[PDB]
Design a protein around this nucleic acid. Structure first.
Length: 60
RNA sequence: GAUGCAGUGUACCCGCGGCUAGACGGAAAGACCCCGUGAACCUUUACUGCAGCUUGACACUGAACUUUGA
């Protein structure tokens, strides 16, 4: 699956990078625990549109 | 393998008590035997399927280090 990282991951990328991961990884660890979001068009519109700066200065 | 055919012998008409030599006596479309491109159930290294058991591939199924083969 294709995901956009909401918050920093050790090897995937940082704060909004779009990466492809194995389906189980995203389905069972990232998405339920809020560490990423699915890379759909509406979710992208949501991510860069408004809450981008909020995720940014919530660096820690 | 004859009461009923041929020849011949014997024999007046009809019961009752007994008897079982015969009526290939009665009883059950022979069970033995053979046949039908009949049946059923059982067996097996007869044939062909399937359940069960088991092998690997793909899916559910992810994250990090590492070592080694052609």
């Amino acid at each position: 699956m294709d995901v956009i990282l909401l918050q920093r991951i050790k090897n995937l990328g940082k704060l909004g990078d779009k990466v492809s991961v194995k389906a189980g990884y995203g389905r069972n660890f990232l998405i339920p625990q809020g560490k990423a979001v699915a890379a759909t068009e509406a979710n992208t519109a949501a991510f860069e549109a408004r809450r981008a700066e909020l995720e940014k200065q919530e660096a820690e």
